[PDB]
Amino acid sequence: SIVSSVAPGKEPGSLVCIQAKDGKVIGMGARVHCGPATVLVTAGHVLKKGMIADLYLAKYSVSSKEGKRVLMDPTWKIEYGSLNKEADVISVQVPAAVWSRLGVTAARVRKPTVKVPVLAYGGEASGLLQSSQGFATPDGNMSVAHSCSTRPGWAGTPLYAGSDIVAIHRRWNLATNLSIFHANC
């Protein structure tokens, strides 16, 4: 798996970091279309931390030439998924105002295909992102096997196939086949 630096602002427009209050990146996520609206999608064990501590959605701002972030409200409604279950995927009805302030566009969820090329993103700061290349294969249940290298703090990051998201990375590999749970939309 080839690992590469991603220049500030050149990551996909849907991607967001999830930070603790001291700025540490503890997970990733993305804005995706969900019926007539959009949702955050991330790992359930990442979102669970925001029940007892403050988490922030974070993304590099091209116009400000620095990172920006917005406090997460744990009472934002859950669209699908769960904080504690095996698939470890959850989606949240984040207000459009928050996505607007961070510059986050919505991506499309697509079904994975066999050995589809994929990119996964993560990093220690919103202008210090990196990507890892790999391939993804769905298992006929709710998961995808994939070959992207990841680091701790990449939990919840999408696997991108071209423009679209086909999976959610779980933990530092088996990702969740997002289209399975996205059918709740």
Numbering used by the authors: 5 to 176, 183 to 195
What does the paper say about this structure?
Sobemoviruses encode serine-like 3C proteases (Pro) that participate in the processing and maturation of other virus-encoded proteins. Its cis and trans activity is mediated by the naturally unfolded virus-genome-linked protein (VPg). Here, we solved a full Pro–VPg 3D structure of ryegrass mottle virus (RGMoV) that demonstrates the structural changes in three different conformations due to VPg interaction with Pro. The overall fold change of Δ117Pro is typical for CLP and is very similar to the structure of SeMV Pro.
We crystallized and solved 3D crystal structures for two catalytically active forms of Δ117Pro: one in its VPg-free form, the second in its VPg-bound state with fused VPg at the C-terminal part (Δ117Pro-E/A-VPg), and one catalytically defective Δ117Procm form with S159/A mutation. The expression of the Procm variant confirmed the importance of S159 for the catalytic activity of RGMoV Pro. These two conformational shifts are driven by the presence or absence of VPg, since they align well in the Δ117Procm and Δ117Pro cases, which do not contain VPg at all. Different crystallization conditions could be at play, but it is very likely that these differences are actual representations of natural conformational oscillations in the Pro molecule.
